[PDB]
Amino acid sequence: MQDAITALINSSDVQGRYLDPSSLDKLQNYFQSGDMRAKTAIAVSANAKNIVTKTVAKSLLYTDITAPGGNMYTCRRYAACVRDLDYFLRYATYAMLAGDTSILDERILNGLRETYNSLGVPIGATIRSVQAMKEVVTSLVGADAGREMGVYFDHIAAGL
Amino acid sequence: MQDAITALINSSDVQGRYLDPSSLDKLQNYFQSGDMRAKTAIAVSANAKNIVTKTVAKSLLYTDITAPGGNMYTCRRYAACVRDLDYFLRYATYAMLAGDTSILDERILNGLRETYNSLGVPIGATIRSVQAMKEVVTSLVGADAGREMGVYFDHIAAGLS
Amino acid sequence: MQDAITALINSSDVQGRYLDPSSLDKLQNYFQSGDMRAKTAIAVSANAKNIVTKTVAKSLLYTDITAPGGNMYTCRRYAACVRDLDYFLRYATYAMLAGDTSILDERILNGLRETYNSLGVPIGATIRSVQAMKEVVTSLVGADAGREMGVYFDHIAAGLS
Amino acid sequence: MRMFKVTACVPSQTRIRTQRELQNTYFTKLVPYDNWFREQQRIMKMGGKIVKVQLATGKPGMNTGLL
Amino acid sequence: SVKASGGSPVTQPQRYHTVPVAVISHAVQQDRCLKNTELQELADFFSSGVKLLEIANTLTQHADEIVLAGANRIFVGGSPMAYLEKPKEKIGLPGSGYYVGEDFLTAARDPLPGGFRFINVSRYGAVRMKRSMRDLAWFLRYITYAIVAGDGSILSANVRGLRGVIPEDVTEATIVALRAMRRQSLDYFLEDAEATQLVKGYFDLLIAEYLTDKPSNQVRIGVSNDQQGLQLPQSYSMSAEVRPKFVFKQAATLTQKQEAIAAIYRHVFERDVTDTYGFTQKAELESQLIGGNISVKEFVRRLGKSRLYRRLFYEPFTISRAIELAARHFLGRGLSSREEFQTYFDVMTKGGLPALVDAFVDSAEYSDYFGEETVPYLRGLGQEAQECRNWGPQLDLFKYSAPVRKVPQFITLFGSYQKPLPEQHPYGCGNDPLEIQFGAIFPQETRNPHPQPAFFNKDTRRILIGSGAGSPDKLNGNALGKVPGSLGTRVLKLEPLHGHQSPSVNLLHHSSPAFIEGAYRQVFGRSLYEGQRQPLSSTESKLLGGEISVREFVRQLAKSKVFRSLYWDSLYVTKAIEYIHRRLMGRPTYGRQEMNRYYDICATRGFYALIDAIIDSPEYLECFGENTVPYERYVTARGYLMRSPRHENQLRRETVPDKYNPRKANWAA
Amino acid sequence: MQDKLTSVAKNCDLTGSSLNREVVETLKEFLADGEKRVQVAGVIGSNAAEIVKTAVSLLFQEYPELVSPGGNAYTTRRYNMYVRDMNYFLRYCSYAIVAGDASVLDERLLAGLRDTFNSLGIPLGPTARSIQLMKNIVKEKLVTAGMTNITFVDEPFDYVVREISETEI
Amino acid sequence: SIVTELILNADSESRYPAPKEIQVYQNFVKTGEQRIRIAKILAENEQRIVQNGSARFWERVPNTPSNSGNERKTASCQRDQGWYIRLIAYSVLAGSEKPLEEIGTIGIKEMYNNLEIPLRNIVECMRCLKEEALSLMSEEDALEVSAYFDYVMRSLS
Amino acid sequence: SIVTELILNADSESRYPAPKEIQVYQNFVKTGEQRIRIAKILAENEQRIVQNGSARFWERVPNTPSNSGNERKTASCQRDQGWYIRLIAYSVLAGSEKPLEEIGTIGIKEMYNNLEIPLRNIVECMRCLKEEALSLMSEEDALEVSAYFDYVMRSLS
Numbered sequence A: 001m002q003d004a005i006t007a008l009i010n011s012s013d014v015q016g017r018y019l020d021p022s023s024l025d026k027l028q029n030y031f032q033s034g035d036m037r038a039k040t041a042i043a044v045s046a047n048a049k050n051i052v053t054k055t056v057a058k059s060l061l062y063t064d065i066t067a068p069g070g071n072m073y074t075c076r077r078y079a080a081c082v083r084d085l086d087y088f089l090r091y092a093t094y095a096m097l098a099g100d101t102s103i104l105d106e107r108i109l110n111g112l113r114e115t116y117n118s119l120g121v122p123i124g125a126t127i128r129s130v131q132a133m134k135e136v137v138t139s140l141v142g143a144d145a146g147r148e149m150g151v152y153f154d155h156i157a158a159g160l
Numbered sequence B, C: 001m002q003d004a005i006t007a008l009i010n011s012s013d014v015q016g017r018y019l020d021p022s023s024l025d026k027l028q029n030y031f032q033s034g035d036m037r038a039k040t041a042i043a044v045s046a047n048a049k050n051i052v053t054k055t056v057a058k059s060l061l062y063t064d065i066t067a068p069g070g071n072m073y074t075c076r077r078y079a080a081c082v083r084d085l086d087y088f089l090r091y092a093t094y095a096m097l098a099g100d101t102s103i104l105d106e107r108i109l110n111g112l113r114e115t116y117n118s119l120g121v122p123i124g125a126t127i128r129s130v131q132a133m134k135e136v137v138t139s140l141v142g143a144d145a146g147r148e149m150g151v152y153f154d155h156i157a158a159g160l161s
Numbered sequence D: 001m002r003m004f005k006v007t008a009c010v011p012s013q014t015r016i017r018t019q020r021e022l023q024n025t026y027f028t029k030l031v032p033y034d035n036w037f038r039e040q041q042r043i044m045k046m047g048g049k050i051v052k053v054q055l056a057t058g059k060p061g062m063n064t065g066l067l
Numbered sequence E: 001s002v003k004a005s006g007g008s009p010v011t012q013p014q015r016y017h018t019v020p021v022a023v024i025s026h027a028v029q030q031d032r033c034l035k036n037t038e039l040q041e042l043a044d045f046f047s048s049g050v051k052l053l054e055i056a057n058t059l060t061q062h063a064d065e066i067v068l069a070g071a072n073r074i075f076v077g078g079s080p081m082a083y084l085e086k087p088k089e090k091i092g093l094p095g096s097g098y099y100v101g102e103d104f105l106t107a108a109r110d111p112l113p114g115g116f117r118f119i120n121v122s123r124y125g126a127v128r129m130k131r132s133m134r135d136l137a138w139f140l141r142y143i144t145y146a147i148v149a150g151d152g153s154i155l156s157a158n159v160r161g162l163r164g165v166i167p168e169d170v171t172e173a174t175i176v177a178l179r180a181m182r183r184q185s186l187d188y189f190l191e192d193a194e195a196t197q198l199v200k201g202y203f204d205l206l207i208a209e210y211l212t213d214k215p216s217n218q219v220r221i222g223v224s225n226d227q228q229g230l231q232l233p234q235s236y237s238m239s240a241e242v243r244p245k246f247v248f249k250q251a252a253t254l255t256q257k258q259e260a261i262a263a264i265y266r267h268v269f270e271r272d273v274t275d276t277y278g279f280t281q282k283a284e285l286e287s288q289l290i291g292g293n294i295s296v297k298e299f300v301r302r303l304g305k306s307r308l309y310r311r312l313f314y315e316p317f318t319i320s321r322a323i324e325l326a327a328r329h330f331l332g333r334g335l336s337s338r339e340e341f342q343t344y345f346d347v348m349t350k351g352g353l354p355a356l357v358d359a360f361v362d363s364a365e366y367s368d369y370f371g372e373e374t375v376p377y378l379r380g381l382g383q384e385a386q387e388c389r390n391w392g393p394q395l396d397l398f399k400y401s402a403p404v405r406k407v408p409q410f411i412t413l414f415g416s417y418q419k420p421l422p423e424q425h426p427y428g429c430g431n432d433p434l435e436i437q438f439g440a441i442f443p444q445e446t447r448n449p450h451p452q453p454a455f456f457n458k459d460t461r462r463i464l465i466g467s468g469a470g471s472p473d474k475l476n477g478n479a480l481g482k483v484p485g486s487l488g489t490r491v492l493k494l495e496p497l498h499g500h501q502s503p504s505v506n507l508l509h510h511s512s513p514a515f516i517e518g519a520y521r522q523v524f525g526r527s528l529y530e531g532q533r534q535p536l537s538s539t540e541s542k543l544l545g546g547e548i549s550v551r552e553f554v555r556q557l558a559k560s561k562v563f564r565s566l567y568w569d570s571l572y573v574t575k576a577i578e579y580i581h582r583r584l585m586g587r588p589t590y591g592r593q594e595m596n597r598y599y600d601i602c603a604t605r606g607f608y609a610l611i612d613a614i615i616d617s618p619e620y621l622e623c624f625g626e627n628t629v630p631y632e633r634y635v636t637a638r639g640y641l642m643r644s645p646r647h648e649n650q651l652r653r654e655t656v657p658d659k660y661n662p663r664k665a666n667w668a669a
Numbered sequence F: 001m002q003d004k005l006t007s008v009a010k011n012c013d014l015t016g017s018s019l020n021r022e023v024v025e026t027l028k029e030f031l032a033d034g035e036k037r038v039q040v041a042g043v044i045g046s047n048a049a050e051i052v053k054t055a056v057s058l059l060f061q062e063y064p065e066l067v068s069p070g071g072n073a074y075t076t077r078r079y080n081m082y083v084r085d086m087n088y089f090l091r092y093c094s095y096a097i098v099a100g101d102a103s104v105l106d107e108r109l110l111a112g113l114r115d116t117f118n119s120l121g122i123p124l125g126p127t128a129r130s131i132q133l134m135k136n137i138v139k140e141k142l143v144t145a146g147m148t149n150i151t152f153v154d155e156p157f158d159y160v161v162r163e164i165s166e167t168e169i
Numbered sequence G, H: 001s002i003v004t005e006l007i008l009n010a011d012s013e014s015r016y017p018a019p020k021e022i023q024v025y026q027n028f029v030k031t032g033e034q035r036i037r038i039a040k041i042l043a044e045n046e047q048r049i050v051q052n053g054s055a056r057f058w059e060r061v062p063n064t065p066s067n068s069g070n071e072r073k074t075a076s077c078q079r080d081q082g083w084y085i086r087l088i089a090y091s092v093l094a095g096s097e098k099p100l101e102e103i104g105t106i107g108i109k110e111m112y113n114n115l116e117i118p119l120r121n122i123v124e125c126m127r128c129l130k131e132e133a134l135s136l137m138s139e140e141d142a143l144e145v146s147a148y149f150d151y152v153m154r155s156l157s
Ligand SMILES: *[C@H](C)[C@H]1/C(=C/c2[nH]c(/C=C3N=C(/C=C4\NC(=O)C(CC)=C4C)C(C)=C\3CCC(=O)O)c(CCC(=O)O)c2C)NC(=O)[C@@H]1C
Pocket: A060, A061, A062, A063, A066, A067, A072, A073, A074, A075, A078
C-alpha cells in the first residue's frame, strides 16, 4: 500500500534532497483534486450496488456465459462474479483516494491471473465487465471524476 | 499469438455467428489506431538500444544490484539482464502493434516467474526496470502512444508478480 | 514391449526357473487363440476407416462437442479427434495381436490423461467414444473377437479414467 | 454433549518480552467435555488458576446419550 | 546444501505512515468501503494540503539557516557548515544525450542544560563533523517530509532507537541542536499560530522519540523445540501497517459485537461467506457469543467444526493442503517446519478434521496471541519477526488465491529443503514437457500452480535414462539403457544415391513415402494433415533425387512454417527451446550451459538460427550423421516412470520346519 | 537439527560399517576439541553485541554508500535491521560451533534465506562481507583470550558465505 | 490476420518489423473500412447465397448426401455452406486466409472423409456458392471473396 | 454517534486519537446547534409529516394492512411512522445512523415478517415520509436527514 505522497517522498528521499518544485506541484495537484476525489468516493460508496447491477445488465446478462455451461451459470457463480465486480469497484475507489496504483498491484493483480486461470473464469468477459463498470461510474460521477476513476479501472483491466 | 482482429473473430466464432455491431466498432477503432501504432513501432525500433540503455541507467545502475555480489554483477549477468530487457521491449512493441497482450502471455510470461526464482533474479528489481522502461518510452514517443505502450508494459509487470 | 509369450517368460525368469505346467498351458492357450487374433487384426485393418466413422457418428456427432465452442469444433480439432481415435484403434489392434496391454501403456496411455486435462479435451466424451468404438468393433468381428478387442478398449478407457 | 462452565484467570507470562497488547485474563466460559482436559492442562501450564468448574450440561455417571 | 526455493514473492514493506495510507489500510483490512468519518478525515487532510506544502516549502527555503542555527549552538572552534555535503546530481549518465557520438571533450566548454560542553570542530574530526552536519540536515528534511505526509511516523520509526546509534556522548548536544533548529523554524512563521503549532509538535515528537533509551526488541518465542525464536526492532513494527484488532466484550453494544463477529467470519472463512452459503446455524452460535456463554475461542472452534468450514476448506483439498490452510485460518500464520506438519498430520489421521481444529485452537500459541476475547488476525511481515524457512509459502498463503492452489506448498518445500537438487529442468518443473509421442504439453504457471524452483547453477548436468535405441554399430558405449516404448534398431536411415531410367520395382528397407512419413513423424511427432505437406514437396523431391541428405531434409522440415507454428509461435521461448531440442537431438538438454547457449542464439538471431545450431552441432553428427532421422535416446525419470505402470512382476512376496516341537515350554508337566 | 555425535551415530547404522576404526578416530578427534568449542561459544556469547557493532561499523566503513540516501542501510529502521540480522548470523554460527555440525545452519538460518533476501532486496555481497568481518573479530577475540587451535571457528562463517553468495565462476 | 503474420515473421528473425513490413501494416489498416463493408455484405446476403447455391448445386450434382431425402443431412449441408461463407467473411476482415485456414481448412479432408461426404461434391457446392456470392458484389470487392472460395476449393481437392 | 466511532477506530489500533480524528470530532461538535435545531423541527412537525406521508402512502399503496379498515392497524402504523421519525431525529443528533440501527433497524425484517406486514409497503411508506420531511427544511439540513431515511429503506430491503 502506497499513496502519491509516499511515492513523491520516496523519490525525493532516494536522492537525499528536499521536495523540489516539481514534486511540490504534483503534491499540490493531488491535494487540490482530493476534494472531488472524496466526493466521487462518497457517490460510489452510495451507488455501488446500482453500478454493479447496471454493469452486469449491459455487459454479462443474456449472453452465453449466463446460459448453462457458462461461467456465470448457477447462483453461486453469479454471486461470485457480482462479488468480483464489487471488489474491483471498491479497490478502484481505494486507488483513486490514494492517488496511486500500488493498492491494486498489491491486493488485486497479485494472484488474479492465477486465480482466474485455475478456476476457468474468462478473462475477456471480465475485461468487458470492468469496461462497462468504468462507463457507468463515469456517467454517474461526472466527466473528470469518471476519467480519474477510469485510470484505475484501466489499470485493473490491463493487469488481466 | 493473437491480435485484435483475431480476438474479435474468435469471440464471434465461438458463438458461430458473424461479428456483431459492437465487434465491428471495436475493429474500426483498431483500424483507426493502426497508424499511431505503426508510428510508435517505428520510433521504438529506431531507439531500441537507447531505450534499454536509459532504462538500465534509470533503474539499475549505481545500486546494490550492479555492485560486487549483486545479480547484475559480472559482465555476463549484466549482458543477460540487458538481453531480457531487449526481449521485453521487442515483445511490448509486438503487442502494441497487435493490439493484444496475447503474445506477451504466450511467449514472455508463461514460466518467467519460476525461471527467475530458479536463477535468483530479483523480480521486484525487474518490475521496477520495466516501469522505468515504460517511463523512458513515454518520454521518447509521447503521452498517448506512451500510454498505449505502457498498457503492455503494465501487463508485463503484472505478469512478473 | 511385452506380448503374452514374453510376459510368461519374464514371470518365469524373475523366479529363475523354466516355465511351469501352468505357464505352458497359458502359452498353449495363446498359441491356440493366435488364429482368431490374426483374423481379427485383418478385419480391423480392413475396416479401420469406417470403424472410426461409425464411432464418431454414434458418440460425438450432433452433440455440443461438434457445435461452435465445442472441443471438436473447427476442422483442425475434428481431425485431431479422429486422429486420436485412429491411434486408439491401431494400438488396440497391436495389443490384441500381442495378447498384452504393455504397448498401450508405454505408447498411448503414458500421460494421455494429463495431456487431455492440459488441452481441455473432455475425458468423459473420450471414454464414451472408446466404448462406442468397442461396440462397433464387436459388431464387425463378432462376439468372441469383439470381447477380446474390448479387453484392450476397456484398458484404454480405464487409462483415461 | 457434556459442557463444563469454567471460570479461570490466566495471566500472560511473556507479555513484557513480546510486548503484546494487554488482554483480559479473567474469563468464564462453556468448554466441551472433550476439550476440557486439554484446556485445563493448558491453563495449569500457563500458571493460571482454575477458580470454578461446574458440569453445566450433562449428568454425572451417564453411560449413554453423551452425544 | 539448501538448494530448494519457496519462491520470492514481491513484497513492499511500509517504511512510514501517511494519512491516506493509514485510512485506506484500515478500510482495506476490514473489507469495506470508507466510512463517513474516514472520508471526512481524508477530506480534511486534502483541504489542508496546500498549507502543509507552504509550511514545508518555507522550511526548505531556509534549510541552511535552520541547520546553521542548530550547528552554531553546539560547535566551536571552526565552521560547521563547511562539512555539510549537499546531494550531487548525476549528470551525463549513459543514454542521456549529454555526449553526442563518441566525442567527450567538447561537452565541457532556550537555556543550555547544566554543565553542557561544546564540541570543538577541529578535535572532533572531519568524519564526525560530516556525520553531525548530515544528521542535522537529515532531521530537517524528515521533518518537512512528516509535515507533508500529515503523520510523524517517518520521524518516530527512525529516531526511536537512534539514541546510542548516534554516540551517547553527544545525545545531549543533539537535543540542544534540535531545539536550536526548532527555535529558528518558529522564527519563520511568527504570524500563524497553526503552522507554528504543527512545527512545534513535530519537533517535540522528534525530541521525545529520540530520547527513548534502547527500546526493547519484540521477541517472538518459538512455540516448540522445532521452531526458532526471533526478534523484531520496534522501528519495523511502528513503520508497518496496523492490524485493526477486535476484542469481544459482552458489555459492548450489539453493533460492535456484530462487527467483531464479522471480523471472525472474515478471518476463519477468508471472507464473510456466511450469508452467501445460508449459514443459518450461525445465528445460534452468535447468540451463544453475544450472551457470553462462550468466548471468541470457542466460537472459532465451533466455526472450524461447522459444515461450512468443511465445505469450504476441507472438501476441495487434500489433507496436506487442508492442514496448511487451517494453519492460517486458526493461527493467522503458515506452518513453520515439517515437524509441525507431522504433528498436525498425525492429529488429523487419528481424529479427523474436528481433531485438527481442536489442536489448532487449544494450542498455547492461540491463547498467547488471541487469548479468549481477541478475534484471530493475520500475523506476518511487519507484525512480528518472520522466519526465512517458510517465507514464500506463508506470503503466498496470506494471499486471497491461497484456496485456489491445491498442491501443498509447505510440506513439499520442507521436504525438499533436506534433499539435493531435484530431477527437473534448471528453469523449473514448468520447463519439462510431457514425454509423449507428439505435442508440447507443459505445466502452465497460472493454472493449478505448483512451481518448485531450485537454485541450479550454470554447471549442473542432468541425469538422463538412456533408451537403448540406435543401430547396433552405434551402440556398446551406452547399451545398458532400456526404456519401454523404444524402437531399438528401427531407426530410419537412407543411404545416399549415386543415364538410364530405373527399374519399375526397386525396393529399399522403407519405400520413399514410408521413409518420408517416418521423417515427418519423428520431426513433428506425428503425421501432418493432408495439404500441410504442400510447402515441403520440393524439399522431398531433393531428398529423393539425392540432392540433399537426410540431415538437410530434417533441417528443412524443422524450418518450415508448420513446425514454427506448432512448436515456436505460441510457446514460451525456453519451453520451445527444450521441446525442439528433444525433438531434434532426441534428448533433453543437460543443463544451463546448453540452455543458455540456445537462448542466446534465439535472442540474437532467432528461430532459424536455433534450428541451424541444433542441427549443425557436433553431437548431432556423432549420433545421427547425415543419413539417419533422429530418434529418442534419453528420457527423464518421470518420463521413464510414466511408461512403466505395471509392477506385478516385482510383488512375488517374501518349508521344512527348522525346530522340532515348536512353541512349547521346557519341562511341561 | 543434529549435532556431530548424533549424525555420526546415525550414520553408523545407516552405512552398515557399524563402529569401525575410522568412526572411532573421527569421534575421538571431535571430542578432543569439545571443550574448545564450548569456550569459543562462551566468548561469542559474552561479546555478541560488541562483535556485531564492530562488524557493522567496519561494513559501513568499507561500504560508505550503504548509509547514504538510497542505500540499504539508509535510515535507523534499516540500520536496526542490519544489526538484528548480523546478530542472527552470529547466534546461529555459535550454535554450529557448539554442535560441530552445520545442520542447524541449514535448517534454521539458510533455508529460504535467499528467497527472503531477494524479496526484500537485501544485497548479498555486503551480507557476506559482514559475516566475514564478524568471523575476523571473533578470531581476534579468541586469540586475545589465549586460544590456539581455533581452525573450526572458521567453518560456520565461511560455510554460510558459500551458501548465500552467488556463483561467479 | 496479416498483422499476426507480420509480427511472427519479424519474431522468427528476432528483429523489429522492417520498413517494408510496416508499409504492409499501414496499407492493410488503411483499407479496414472496405473490408468491414465487404464482411457486412457477406453477412447480410448469406442466406440467399446459401439458398441459390444449394439450388444450383443440387441441379448440377443430384447424387449427393444432401438431397438423399434426409432432412438432417440437408440442414447440415446448408449449415456448412453458411459456416464457410462466415469463414470467408472472417478472412476478408483479417486481410489473410489465416482465419479460414485455421477454422475450416486444416484437416477439412480428414473431417469430411470421416463424415463420408464426397470431396468433389463439396468442391462443386463451393463453386456454386462462389458464383452466387460474386453475383451480389462488385468485382473489386469480390476479388478476395473469389480468392478465398478458390482457397477452400483447392484445400478440398 | 461520530464520537464513539472515532474512539473505537482509535481503540482498535491501540493508539491515542490521531490529529485528523480530533479535527473531525471538533468539526462535529461545532455543528451541534444545527443538529439540535434539525431534531427540533423534526419533533415539532412529526404529526403533520406522519399525516401527509400516510395519506400519500395510502394513495399509492391502497392494499396495505393499515388501509384495511382496521382502526388498531392504522393507529399502530402511524405510531411506527412517528417512531421512525423519532429515530431519524436521534440519528441526526448523534451524527451517525447508530441510534437508528440499534433501536429500529437491526432485526427490522424479522420483526415485520412476524407481524405479517409486507416489507415493500413499509419501504413505500418510508419513501413517502422522507419526501414529506425533506420539504419542511432547508436543502442543506436535508443532507443528513435524507441519508438516514435511506438507511431505513436499505435495511428493510
Ligand atoms: C420468475 C419466477 C421471477 C422473475 C425472474 C426473472 N429472472 C430474470 C433473469 C435472470 N434469471 C436468472 C436466473 C438464474 N441463473 C442461474 O444460474 C439460476 C440457477 C439455475 C437461476 C435461477 C438470471 C441469471 C437472469 C439474468 C438474465 C439471463 O438469464 O441472462 C428476469 C429478467 C431480469 C432483467 O432485468 O432482465 C426476471 C424478471 N421475476 C419475477 O418477478 C418472478 C418472481
